[PDB]
Amino acid sequence: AMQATTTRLVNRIWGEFYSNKREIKWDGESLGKTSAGEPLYQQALVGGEMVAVGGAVTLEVDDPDEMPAIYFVEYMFESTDHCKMLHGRFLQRGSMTVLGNAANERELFLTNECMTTQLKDIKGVASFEIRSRPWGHQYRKKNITADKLDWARALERKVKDLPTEYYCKSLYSPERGGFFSLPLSDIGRSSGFCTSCKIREDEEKRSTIKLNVSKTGFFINGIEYSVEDFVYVNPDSIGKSGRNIGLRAYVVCQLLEIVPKGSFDVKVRRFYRPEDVSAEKAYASDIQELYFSQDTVVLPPGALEGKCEVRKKSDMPLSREYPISDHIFFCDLFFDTEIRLATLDIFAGCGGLSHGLKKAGVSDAKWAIEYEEPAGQAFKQNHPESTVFVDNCNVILRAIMEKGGDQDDCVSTTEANELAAKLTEEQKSTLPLPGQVDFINGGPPCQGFSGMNRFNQSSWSKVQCEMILAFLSFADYFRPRYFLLENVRTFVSFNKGQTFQLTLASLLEMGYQVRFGILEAGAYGVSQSRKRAFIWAAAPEEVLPEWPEPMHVFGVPKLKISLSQGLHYAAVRSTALGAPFRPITVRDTIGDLPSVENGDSRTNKEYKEVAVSWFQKEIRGNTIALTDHICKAMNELNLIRCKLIPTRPGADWHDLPKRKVTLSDGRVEEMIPFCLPNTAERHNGWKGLYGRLDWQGNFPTSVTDPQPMGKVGMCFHPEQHRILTVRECARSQGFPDSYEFAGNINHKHRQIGNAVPPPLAFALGRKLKEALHLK
DNA sequence: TGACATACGATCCAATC
DNA sequence: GATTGGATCGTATGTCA
Ligand SMILES: [Zn+2]
């Protein structure tokens, strides 16, 4: 329970943790002409002051109490009517963005909105500059100095009531959910052409249904469809821990003809899927298998959702990735009706995020920081070439800053200073130094903001929330190329969004490109409902990664993030009405494991049955040792209650009779727990407590302590009178069967419940790998 | 100290009106 | 605009053997 060690920058940004008639003349002469035949100018005198390409003008607004609008000048031209006109791009204020009250008063953000006005209608010319600043760990001490000089000159200008000076260094895209680098070669060309207008024109050209001159094809949503192509159709256009029951995947069809009926209709021939026969057939079949039919449909062009490929089993790719990512299917039967980055992992845990990023090919987890002995031991067991520190991150940061000589840039506690002096010389020799770390990744605690926390204004929750500041100080000190932050969904709305806004403002104060999003794990290949928030940060001359495409059906709506002024952003689509692949069930995950009783402790066992489903075949791999198939022991009364709950979908504590139980030691208890009928009707009746899983459903969210009378509940096996084992809980989060956990059973459950799914980490790392090849 | 069992609030957001 | 269900890497307290 140690308070965070920050740099001065983070301390100053947060401040609430440890320490607080007019004559209009064309200047010069034209330098070219617009295609319409209009002279272009570079400078103009308005009211005695100079308006130039690269400056800013203010336009007047209706309501008086609102501040005027600022526009960046792109070009000036003289039209046929001899009217003096300019084109401008909108410069938004930081207070009108997702930053809110955390934004600077002098910082403006460039947008893709445009304007064209006459020079008579401008109110004034503003003092404006574009800030381009070098990137590196070797410049941050110089950047501090200038920044101080910039702050002082501001307050004096404020106390004398002088005009404000503005600067711009980023571009705000609310439809991409982020702040991006300025395209410096496309702005201020003083030419009649503008890139934002070109973007809008191309956008409006790509929303129309147009036929090819040969009626052999058609353009829709920016995709070209030809005859004999394979296409996706919504299932509706042709015809608890479980809500994917009856959610169907895309229908795969071959396009045969274009029917005239310019309006037209399409003719398709459909394929069938293994789950269109039975659930037993879908259990034993591959996810990429289809069946041939002769059934033909006539559809409107708007029923098509994308293109795919259908091959033979022999011609399939020989690379097998667990998140499939491939739009390729195979048909056999018939249906009769180089760039590896040096990575520092902070708050490493057991290593799921690392595991995925290492499988993607972008990270070598060279250093890791984990204060818990069993978790550090597990990380060392699974990643043997990594240097693991089993200290507090505050102590490690203090030691690194002492090694660099910047003790006076560090804000720390006496306790952390004393603990940093106790490190041995070999430990201090192995610490990373700035200029050696290219990637920083980490999942700060998820307990301060989680909604399940009844006590969030207590002393323990506040420090866990405060670890964000230490995580940001690591990025401030090391200035890496790439930065990845992971947390819960409620991190973006914790206390009216202030923590999210302050994190974004801190990342922007250093000079990063930042983007944010929320992702659902079940759409990427796990049988779980897990909603997580991700933040990407990149250097000004890097490419900021995109988001991975979800390819599994899962019944979750649009995960949205609130952007101020009534706007919202969604990172990915909803797969509830259709997706390339079917959902993963509980029987797909745990249906091949052998039977165990209550409180089994044998750690090393043997597999008895072979893998049947796709998920089983690819989680087992080539492993012959079954490890950690162990469950927690329930007492006599809880085991009596567990055996008396039916093996039906949706069975919970409401199925327990009102009765008195005599135990072995002559105690008389009551079968129904007193707390469950007491606080009900405030909590939706506690559905799923003492609840059994459904074979055709999915798992609930993986928590650190699975117990029958918890908030989440539903830890009972669908058929066996026990709680789920460690291996089953690791299979629900996507861990391979060869992954090793350390400690007692409680520590292993804690390690599994805290992790990022390795499949989702691999999906994110693949997009980072694509971003690294585009530089 | 530790292990294990019990008791249990407020906010956000999408269907259904 | 109104109001219901559903969501969900939990924390504090008391007994105990
Ligand atoms: Zn324009």
Domain spans, chain A: 31-204, 207-334
Nearest to A89 by CA among A200, A9, A1, A178: A200
Tokens for A343? 């990575």
Closest by CA position to A711, among listed A697, A721, A700, A723: A700
Please give the Cα distance from A245 to A696 (Å, whole number): 7
CB of A463 lies under 7 Å from some atom of strand C: no
Other CB atoms within 10 Å distance of the CB of residue A104: 16
Q: Which residue has the tokens 């990149």?
A: A538
Cα dist from A99 to A3, A109, A401, A448, whole Å: 26, 11, 30, 21
Residues A580 and A551: their CA atoms lie apart, in Å, by: 5
Instruction: Give strand pairing partners of A51.
Output: A44
Give how far the C-alpha of residue A141 lies from the chain's centroid of Cα atoms, to the nearest Å.
32
A732 CB contact with strand C at below 7 Å: no
| Pairing of β A341-346 and β A439-442 | parallel
Q: Radius of gyration of chain A from Cα atoms? A: 30
Cβ A637 to strand B below 7 Å: yes
Three-class SS state of A283: helix
Task: Tell me the longest C-alpha to C-alpha distance in chain A.
Answer: 105
What is the whole-number distance in angstroms between the Cα of residue A129 and the centre of ligand 1?
A: 20
How far, in Å, is the centroid of ligand 1 from the Cα of A206?
19
Give, as ranges, the nucleotides of chain B with any atom within 7 Å of a protein CB. 3-15
Instruction: Give all strands of the β-sheet with A328-334 in edge-to-edge order.
Output: A289-292, A328-334, A304-311, A230-233, A251-259, A265-270, A296-299
Would you call A247 helix, strand, or coil by DSSP?
A: coil
Query: Helix H segments across A601-753?
Result: 614-620, 636-642, 675-678, 726-732, 745-753
Question: Structure solved using which method?
Answer: cryo-EM
Which residue is the nearest neighbor of B10, CA to C1'? A454
Helix or strand holding residue A762 (H, E): helix A758-772
A197 CA, C9 C1': Å apart: 45
- Residue A252 near residue A328 (C-beta atoms within 8 A): no
CA of A197 to the centre of ligand 1 (A): 4
Tokens matching residue A507: 């990342």
Alpha helices in A430-536 (DSSP H): 459-478, 498-510
Chain C footprint bases within 7 A of protein beta carbons? 5-12
Closest CA to A301 of A252, A271, A251, A259: A259
DSSP state of A384: T
d(CA A314, CA A311): 8
> Taking phi first (over 0 means left), then psi (-120 to 50 degrees means alpha), and beta for anything else, what does residue A759 get?
alpha
Instruction: Please check whether strand C approaches the CB of A700 to within 7 Å.
Output: yes
Distance CA A421, CA A401 (A): 12
What's the gap in Å between A90 CA and the centre of ligand 1? 10
Could you give the angle at the alpha carbon of A140 between the alpha carbons of A137 and A141, nearest 5°? 120
In the three-class reduction of DSSP (H, G, I as helix; E, B as strand; rest coil), residue A33 is classed as strand
Phi and psi, residue A199, nearest 5°: -60, -45
DSSP code for A207: S
Minimum CA–C1' distance nucleotide for A454: B9
Q: Are A128 and A89 in contact (CB under 8 A)?
A: no
Residue A248 DSSP one-character state = -
Report the b/e string of A496-509 with b at 16+ CB within 10 A. Answer: ebebbbbbbbbbbb
Q: Is A328 exposed, middle or buried (0-12, 13-18, 19+ CB in 10 A)?
A: middle
Both structure tokens of A88: 């401008």
Report if CB A146 to strand B is under 7 Å: no
CB of A454 under 7 A from strand B? Answer: yes
Is residue A260 exposed (0-12), middle (13-18) or buried (19+ Cβ within 10 Å)? Answer: exposed
DSSP H helical segments within A479-530, as ranges?
498-510
SS3 of residue A273 by DSSP: coil
Name A residues 551-610 whose Cβ lies under 7 Å from strand B: 557-558, 560, 562
Q: What is the C-alpha to C-alpha distance for residues A355 and A343, in angstroms, rounded to an integer?
A: 12
The Å distance, CA of A398 to C1' of B15, is: 51
Distance CA(A275)–CA(A234), nearest Å, equals 16
Topology of domain A207-334, per CATH? SH3 type barrels. (2.30.30)
> Selecting from 1.20.1440.230, 2.30.30.490, 3.40.1190.20, 3.40.50.720, what CATH number does the domain A31-204 have?
2.30.30.490
Cβ burial of A39 (10 Å; 0-12, 13-18, 19+) is middle
A265: number of Cβ within 10 Å? 14
**Strand A210-211 and strand A217-220: pairing?**
antiparallel
- Give the Å distances, CA to CA, from A187 to A183, A193, A198, A424: 7, 10, 13, 54
To the nearest 10 degrees (0 to 180), the angle between helices A373-382 and A745-753 is: 70
Beta strand A439-442 with A56-59: parallel, antiparallel or unpaired? unpaired
Q: Cα(A88)–Cα(A194) distance, rounded to whole angstroms?
A: 9
Q: State how far the Cα of A743 lies from the Cα of A749, in Å rounded to an integer.
A: 10
Q: Which residues of A are known catalytic residues?
A: 446
Q: What is the DSSP letter of A552?
A: B
Helix (H) or strand (E) holding A399: helix A393-404
Same fold, A31-204 and A207-334: yes
> Which residues pair with residue A483 across a beta bridge?
A440, A537
Q: How far is it, in rounded angstroms, from Cα A135 to Cα A542?
A: 11
How far does the centroid of ligand 1 lie from the alpha carbon of residue A207, in Å?
Answer: 20
Distance between alpha carbon A618 and the CA centroid of its chain, in Å? 25
CB of A461 under 7 A from strand C? yes
Nucleic strand C under 7 Å from the C-beta of A488: yes
